[model samples]
Target: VQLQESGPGLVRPSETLSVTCIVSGGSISNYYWTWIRQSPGKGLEWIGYISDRETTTYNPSLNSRAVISRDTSKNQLSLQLRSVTTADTAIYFCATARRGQRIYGVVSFGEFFYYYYMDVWGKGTAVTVSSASTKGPSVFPLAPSGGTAALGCLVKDYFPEPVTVSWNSGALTSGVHTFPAVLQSSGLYSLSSVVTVPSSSLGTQTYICNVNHKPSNTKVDKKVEP
Candidate 1:
C-alpha cells in the first residue's frame, strides 16, 4: 500500500482544516486508516483512525474537534480538525495498520507472536494555523504521582514557543527534569516539568510553578499543596 497526503499549507483561525490521504495500490479494507501529526519540534500525536466499516476513534484530548472519515470508493481517507487556532499548526501524515490483531504478543502454537505494523507513511502535508491574536500559556499543577516528594507542572496552549518554567521562584532546581515542548491539536504548545521536593513540606508548605512567556508579558504562577 502507498500513501500520499494533500492539504492546505496555511489556514486562518476558527476555520476547519481539511486534509486527505490518497491511497493507491492497495484495498482500503479490514484496516485502520490513521492520521498522525507532529509539530516543529515535538513528538507524534495520533489524531484518530477509521476502519473501512466507518468505525472511528479519536483522541479524547481533542474535545471532539477532530473527525476522520474514509472514502473507499476513491481509495482515500480524510481528516478534519475544526475551530483552528495558531496553536494547531503542524505536519500531518497518514498511515495504516491491519485490524483484529493484538498490538502486544499474540498467542499462537503456544508461542508468542506480534501483529503486523504500519509500514507505509505519507511524506506528510504541512498545515500552519495563523491568526492575529496571540495567546500565552496556561500554567497548572498536576497530581502528585511519582510521590508526595515530587511535583508536576504543565504549561499549555501557548504560541510562539519561547517560554520559561521555574520551580519555586527559581530557587529549587536540584531534582528538576523539564521536558521539551509538544504541539497540541489546538495549534499551541504544551510543556511539562517534574521536580523533587521535601516530602515533609507537602502539608505545611506550598510549592509554586512560575511561568514566563515573552508575549503578553505572560507571568503565570501556579501553586500546589497536599
Candidate 2:
C-alpha cells in the first residue's frame, strides 16, 4: 500500500497546512495513522499518529494539543491545528506504522499506559502543511509478533510505572499481572508484557494491558490465539 497527500499550495507563512493522506492497497482497520512534519531546516519531528484501534498521540514538542484523525471508510487521514504561526511552517507528511510490537501496560482509571521509545521508522515524504499536495511511496512490513510460542505481548520500560494487565472474556480483573523495569533505550523508560495462557484458554481469550498515565491514558490489547 502507499500514502498520498493532497491540498492547496502557497499557504501563508503562519497558516496551518491542511492536507489529507489517502491509503491504498491495505486495510486501514488495524493500523496506526501518523502525521509528522519537518521544519524548513530542522530535524524530523514526531507529530504522533492514530494507532490501529483509533488512539492518538500528539508530539510533546507540539504541546500535546494538535489533533489528528482518520477516516477508515474513505481510506483517508486528516490533521487540524487550532492556531497557526510561523514556527509551524514545515513540510507535513502522513504515514502509517505499527503500534507496538508487544503490549506494555494495563489500563487504570479510564486509561491505558505503556512506555517505550520509538525504535523503528518509515521513510518520510515531504509536503508543505500549508496547502501543497504530494503523494509518496508506501512502506509496509510483516506485522510485529512475540518471540515465543506461548502467545504473549511485550512492553519494555526503563523506569517501571505502576501498571495493570487484565484479561477480558466479558469481565475485568485487577492486578492479574504487572511488569518490572527493563532497559530498552538509553536513559529512557521501557517495559514489556507477556501473558501466558493455557492451551484451552488461548482460543477464547483476549488480553489487554492498561497503564495508568494519570491525566492522559492509553491502552493496547491483543487476541492470544486469533
Candidate 3:
C-alpha cells in the first residue's frame, strides 16, 4: 500500500493540529486506520484508531483530546487534535495496521488472537505547534534440554523492524531450531534464536548467534558456552 501524509505545517500553541493520510494502491476498507506521533527529540506515541469495521480505540492519555476517523470513499484516515498545546505539537502521522501470525502454541485462541501491528507507515508529515517531536537479535541464550546439547542466544532491543537472527558458529550440523522476533509495545524489536545439538556434542563446544538489522546496517554477534 502507498500512503502519503498531508496537513498544515504549523499550529498555534493552543490551537488544534490536523493531518490526513491518503491511502492508495489499496483499500482502507480492510485495515485499521491509526494515528501516531513523535517528538522532535524522541518517544513514540500511539494516539488512537478507527478499526476497519468502525470500532474505536484510543490511548487513554489522548482519548479525550484525540479524534481518529476514516473516510472510505477517499480511502484515507484523518486525525484531528483538539485543544492543542506545546506538548501536543508533534510530527503528526497516520497509517494502517496489519497482523502477523506467530505459531508457538497449541491452543486455537491464543495463536490466532495475539495482536496487530503497523505493517504500513506513512511518509511522516511534519507538523509544528512549537518545534519538536520524534537492536539486535543477539546470540540465542541456550536453554536446558532433556538429553540434547543445545546452544541458544537471546538478543535484545533492535530497530526499524527489519531484523534477522542467524547461527554462524557451532558443530553437530543442526537440530530443531527456531527464531522469532517480537515488537515491543513501546516500539522496539527483540529476537531469539535456538539450536539444539546432539547429546554427544555438549562438553565445551562454542556457538554463535548473530543479529542483523538491515535498515541501520548493524550486526552483532554473541558467543556462548556453558
Candidate 4:
C-alpha cells in the first residue's frame, strides 16, 4: 500500500545506486512489494519485485548486485539495489506494482506485459532521486443498458490529462464524450468516456481503448462475446 526508499545521498561516479526499500505502511503481505527510481531527469525505472506468496521478477539491470530475497521473513518488507553507477547519481527508491503493466492492447496480439496499476505510493524513498504519482479507464461491457449493449470506458485518473484517447466498436455509433483532463487536488486528472456497440453485434464483437500518456502509452481492452 505504501513504502520508502533508503540507500544514501552520495554514490560517487562509476559507483552504484545501492539502495533498499523499507515499507513503512500498508498491507505488504497482500500483494507484491517492489522498487523503482526516477533519475534526476530520467523516467520511471523498473527496479524489481519481491513477493511473500510465490516468486518475483526483476528489471535485469538488477543482477547479482540486487537482492529481493525472502524479505517475507518479516513484516518489514525490504527491497535492495546494487551495482549502480554515477550515471545514476545513486537515486534509488521503493514502491509496489503488479499486473500494472499493459496486460493487453491492439498493439499486441500474442503479447502481454505489466501495465502495472500502482494503487498506492508516495515520493518513494529517494536516496537522492525523488518522484510521486493512478488508475485510468475502467472499461467494461453492460448488457443492453440502452438501445444496445454498452462497452464503456470509465477513465477516472489520467493524471496531467491523457492526450489521445481513442475507442473503436463494431459501428460508428458515435456518442458524447468528456473532453477535459480535469485537474484536482493532489494533482488529479479524471477523464471519463464511453463506446457503443449495436445490440445485434453485442454478443459477437470486440472493443478497445488506446491511451497515449507521457510516461508510457498503453491500450487496455476486454472482449465481451457470447
Query: What's the TM-score of each model vs. the native?
Result: 0.51, 0.45, 0.52, 0.43
Instruction: Residues 1-226, candidate 2: write the lDDT tens digits.
Output: 7776654422444555566777777887867777777777787777877877688877787874588888878988888654566567656677666533344464444345444344333333333333222221111111122322243345433122223344563354432344564544443334444444445554555555444321112344544444
Candidate 1 residue-wise lDDT, 28-74, digit = tens = 87677888899877789878778667988888977899999988889
Q: Rank the candidates by TM-score, best first.
A: 3, 1, 2, 4
Off by over 4 Å in 2: 101-226
Model 2 residue 168 lDDT?
63
Off by over 4 Å in 1: 100-116, 132-226
Worst 10 residues of 2 by lDDT: 135-144
Candidate 2 displacement at residue 29 in angstroms: 1.2
- What overall lDDT goes with each candidate model? 0.78, 0.53, 0.69, 0.52
The C-alpha local distance difference test score for the whole of candidate 4 amounts to: 0.52
- Tens-digit per-residue lDDT, 30-108, candidate 3: 7777888987577889888887789888889885888888888887788888877767756766777765676776665
Worst lDDT 10-window in candidate 3: 130-139
